[PDB]
Amino acid sequence: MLILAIISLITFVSMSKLSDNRAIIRLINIYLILVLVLDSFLYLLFLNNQTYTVMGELLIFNSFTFYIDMLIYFIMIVISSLYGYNLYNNNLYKTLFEPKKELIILFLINILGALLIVHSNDFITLFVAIELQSYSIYLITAIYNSSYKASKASMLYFFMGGILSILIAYSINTYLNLILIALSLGLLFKIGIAPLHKWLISIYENTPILITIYISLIPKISILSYLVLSNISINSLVISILAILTLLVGSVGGLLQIKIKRLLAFSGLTNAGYMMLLLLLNNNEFSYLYYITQYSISHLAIFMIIIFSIYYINYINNQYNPIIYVNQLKGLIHDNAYLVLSMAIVVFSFIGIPPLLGFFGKLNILMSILNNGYYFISIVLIVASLISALYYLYLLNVSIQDKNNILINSNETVSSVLSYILSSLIILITFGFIYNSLIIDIFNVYFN
Amino acid sequence: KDTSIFAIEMDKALKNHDTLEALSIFYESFEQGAQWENKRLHMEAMTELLIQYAGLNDTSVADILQLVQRIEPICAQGRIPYSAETAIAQNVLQRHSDTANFYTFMNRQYGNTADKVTKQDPQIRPHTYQVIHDYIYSCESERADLAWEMYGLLHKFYVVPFADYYKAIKFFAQDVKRQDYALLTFQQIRKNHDLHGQPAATSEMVAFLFHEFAKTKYKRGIKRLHEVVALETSFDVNRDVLNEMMAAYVSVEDLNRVQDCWAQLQQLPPSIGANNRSVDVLLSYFKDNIHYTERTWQGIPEFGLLPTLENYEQYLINNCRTGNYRRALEITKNMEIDSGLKPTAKIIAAVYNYTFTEQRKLEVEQWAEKAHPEMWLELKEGDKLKSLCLPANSDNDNVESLLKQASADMDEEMSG
Amino acid sequence: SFRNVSLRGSQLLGKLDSRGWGWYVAKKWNIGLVYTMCKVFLRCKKVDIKGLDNLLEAHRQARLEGRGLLTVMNHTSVLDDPVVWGMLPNDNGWIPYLMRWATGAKDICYFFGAGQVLPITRFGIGGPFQPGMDMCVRLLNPNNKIKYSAKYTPYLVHTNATSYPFWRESNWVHFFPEGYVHQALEPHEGTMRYFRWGTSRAVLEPVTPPIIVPMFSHGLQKVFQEIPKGYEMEGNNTNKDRTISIRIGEPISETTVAGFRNEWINLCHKENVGLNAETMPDVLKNGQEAKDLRSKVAAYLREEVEKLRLTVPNMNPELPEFKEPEFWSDIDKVHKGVYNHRGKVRMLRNP
Amino acid sequence: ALFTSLVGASGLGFATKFLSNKIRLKPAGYYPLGYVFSGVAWAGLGLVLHNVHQHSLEVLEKKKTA
Amino acid sequence: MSANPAIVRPTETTEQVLVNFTKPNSLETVLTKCDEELGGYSTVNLALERPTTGKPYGRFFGNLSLDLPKDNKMVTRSGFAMFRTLDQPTNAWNWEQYRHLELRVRGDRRKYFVNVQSATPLASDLYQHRLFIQTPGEWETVVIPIDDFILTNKGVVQEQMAMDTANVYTVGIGLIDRQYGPYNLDIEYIKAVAHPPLEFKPKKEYEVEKETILLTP
Ligand SMILES: CCCCCCCCCCC(CCCCCCCCCC)(CO[C@H]1O[C@@H](CO)[C@H](O[C@@H]2O[C@@H](CO)[C@H](O)[C@@H](O)[C@@H]2O)[C@@H](O)[C@@H]1O)CO[C@H]1O[C@@H](CO)[C@H](O[C@@H]2O[C@@H](CO)[C@H](O)[C@@H](O)[C@@H]2O)[C@@H](O)[C@H]1O
Ligand SMILES: CCCCCCCCCCCC(=O)OC[C@H](COP(=O)(O)OCC[N+](C)(C)C)OC(=O)CCCCCCCCCCC
User: C155 to chain A, minimum CA–CA distance in Å?
Assistant: First the structure.
């Protein structure tokens, strides 16, 4: 699978000695595409509908893990494309994000940790993988630090999370439902949920946007994919309260944001609250896979849209986060009308307007929670969707205003690869529903 | 035979340009047990001996070092007379390239950097200082590094005048293309002003350095110089420094800093505010932006200024490179009437080259032939008129993107 | 210019334009489809274009400087209005504010709303001062902030320093100064009538002189004939090369426009009204001097278009009487056929 | 069954190329060979999906028959 | 429309007046510091001047001496004089939506500095940018980009880290001229402003005389 690919890539980069830090990224991208093709062929030829255990009894490989691996393939190919190919061949976008060999090594380590989280069958492998991912996130954030308080807060958050994980490991080693519940909240706290999210939204706000596009997506996918695959907290009141509170905070608290990346972090919190409701349910593989795939596509699409929008502003706050406030996108329809159309498609998918993928994901979640006797959380989900739609429509309203300003550097060659990838994501969001019956049948036969 | 007789004979042989005979006499006097000591004749004797030995092309450096080592005990404090200090220095520097041996030659006289500096005076012994100066300012870009060392050398044994600072910044920034050495020279000026008692650095130096950094897009130097200027209380920032900072940040394609420099320039009174150099920089910033170029051109009378030939040339380049060929041709035609400036060969060449269309090129050719026949004929004699045009966009590309590429190609071709 | 004219033009513009994202998309796609049909029609036939660059470069200069663009052309076909704009590039085909905003007809003197067509009355009611003319003047006005100048005085630093002069709004007014479709025959084929006073009013009124670009098309009168098979009759046809020739001349000299506007300024100073006055005096509306100046401007525009005419290979010199307003008086509207005005021209008249 | 899947996938590829051109502020039809390449790639993806879905339907019929 | 949520979100402003000497209660906002705390002989005084013509302003004046005090002997460089806004108790300012700093001053030949205290790893770190006086004796607005201040520790340039621009505590003007003699600075206000749009015209006060295309209102 990808585990071998990641370790081979780490070995290659560790002893590469290449002067350019983007040629190695492009080689990594080509390798990832080739390994995706090879692994898909291998799975559909010799690994369909099987659950293998590799090494000892620590790493599991099943259909769920394979599909999460494909999702990581797709996201990682997109992110490597963003890293390798400068969107414009100008100084601004070159200084916007400059990868370094340490950064590639750290990203590969983080991806390996997330994969081990997904493929974990034993609590030892779990412990190791989560600590590896947390250390990778802390180091990646510490590489780019423009403030002292932010660095201290990130360090304290990582230390507290590690201490909590160590305490959970010691408690489970001493030995039952209480231990599993404590582990569940310990894992859930690391992706950002209502009573402890503030630090993660702060870190996302104070991070380079081309780092934020990664660090806001992979941990959620990994943790929620491990949690869903290993059903240990079902019909839990604690998870119910946490999910309801996370939805309420992400929706109502998202209305109070004027910074674009704070708003995106709160949207991610709300979307995690949506998926965290699926932990209360039986037979939640298809719904969770659908929602995580569509959410990953929408997250990548909106982050690419914001990155594209950087070229149409007459000033830059700082080289790492050129756009900070939402009003910097006022009248963006008069600079690139189709970029605003794509952003409208993405936000309407986030709201859950048919026939976009977000609507189908939310409908799957809602049907699952209704057909098993949960009615209050259905109303909670609907109200949260409306309140989130409020600030999504705010972003639209700001971005479709009137702007008469003349822009310096109006023309330059937009990267063909990045624009094509963004268009592909938008078209996926727009017309993936035509493949819904095929997806359902494929999941019924192969993944079950 | 006394040592004085040997010295007289050696001096007489030297006066006949017979260096080998003088060396033979010296070695024979050593073989005969002659005693050499501090006496008036002897210093001149071996000084002329060393001068004439250094005057031989076939003489090796090792033999010179051996002779100097042999002579050193005779001389008091190991200090040969200044005539030898000039002639041997000239031989080592002008005729050969050995900076280490010459460095050790001074170190023999003065082996301590901070101690016993006993700084000399240029008027007393100008020959050695002139020789060192010529050696420093005669090296090319290949020998530039060594020159830098020699520059520091000149500051460790002599008190250079302040004009050498200006002309050394100019030499390192322009001639040998070592702009880092120019920045280090400026930093040395600042260090000597703040630590020692020396005259302060001038805003002219930093303006010149900013100009040279813009000439080669030296981003590191631009950032370091900006940081130095921000906290430097010995000199201020006038319009010239602001103009050159804005040019430097235009060269490195920075939005915020160019806008900051223009904001600083725009708030000064127009007497000491923006000038035609500011207009040049601001027109070169808006190369491919015709709207802000047009707003810049209309603002020249707003600041109490009148366009110059460079202003017109850059304005016409900006007009042609954005597709407005007819507008640029009309401006060129009416330039003499409205402004009183006669279009020159540079202006006509810029209009012709940047007009990437066969029909419009023919039109400008006809205008030039009818109006300035001899100038157009001169432009036909060399290779100033290029024939690059937009290719047929079989890729169905919009004219703006297809035209910016042509403008960049013409910029590269006319750069040199 | 005068305040009342601009106010009435703005009122009629607001009546015929909502400036809303809903109406804008409808107008955009309507104009784009019409332009696409005209473009396909043009490639279906044989057409020779000489000077398209002049119209394209004078439109971008006008929008760049905020002057406004004016176009003068001959009226030989009923459907020559949209068809001729099929030669324009796609940027000027689907962008409605980068497109024409007029139909013409130059007054009487003596899906159209989404097609950017304003109404002009061609009958003997009113005169050269109609709400359509006020609208044309208003669209030729960039702002109400700058003073009236005979020559283009730059103003983009005081207003529109970072803005656009005509932001998402057209400045391209295109008249048909003849007023009616002219379909003369051999030997005086392609000749025009006298240009009317409305185009002169659009030349003089705006506070910023436009960039007038003459045009001439010959051949569309052989397609959209006023009478059926009018040019195919025996003895009425000599050339069988059904070739459409479109010629776009150089923008006219700004010195002549500045001189005409200076005459307008002197006429304004003849009365006590200022350059920017609240209302137009009746003397300037119906007066000998204003009428003479308007006739002179119209004659100059007609002379420019006639000079452009000779570039068409199959043409003959025009009789000196054809340019005189008096020559086309006492014209008949009843024959409905091959008409023989004063035995000098043969026309395909169809009322 | 191949015709509809391939046609829809090719349409999706055409849409992706058109949107890529339009978000770059480039006219439709820019690099027309790109339309062909995008359509062919998406059609191949749709063909793979169709084969896998055919295997899915074949397996489903077996359980329903029994 | 943004509707009601426009009042629920944090308010946004295009400027923030840091120090305003126009009001007659300005001493309570700002505090002065000379070298007498180190034993130096340079004095610092501050006062509000309200002329009949023109807006009221504040006078930051004194006698910047550079004599080593004969009490402790362990001071070496013993000349400086500064004034800064009172210590920040919100616990800090927020400049993240701001780009420039505007100082309306009427300076002299003396050599002034703009000092900013924000969240730094060292409590003695200071962001400094020299106050460039261009027309001494006449009122002028000095605009200093906020990203052009340099980080120093007791006058020594340190490793360059960007200003936090979200935890700014105090701002003020200091005097490290290292020159004897009296000094007097007249200050109207110090504000933090956003990025100004491009202008291609001198300020209205510094306007050249010619015909105006604009119509007189
Ligand atoms: C959701 C879908 C929405 C997509 C909407 C499509 C709307 C595109 C309109 C059709 C379109 C692209 C055809 C591919 C389109 C998609 C292909 C399949 C997808 C089906 C949907 C026809 O393109 C023609 O252009 C030719 C290039 O010369 C090419 O011929 C061959 O190509 C190679 C063969 O391999 C050979 O190497 C090459 O030798 C051949 O020449 C062909 O591309 C084709 O004949 C657009 O082109 C048309 O419009 C413009 C160009 O803006 C053109 O005007 C240009 O610019 C004018 C000033 O602006 C100026 O007058 C002038 O500068 C120029 O005239 C037109 O003249 C016309 O060309
Ligand atoms: C319920 C919705 C049903 C309709 C959906 C499809 C819309 C089709 C639009 C046709 C035009 C087009 O495709 O794009 C063309 C125009 C762009 O304007 P332009 O000046 O012509 O520049 C064209 C680009 N250039 C200059 C490079 C050539 O788009 C628009 O003006 C924006 C979309 C319509 C109005 C949006 C604001 C209000 C609604 C916001 C919804 C998010």
Answer: 16
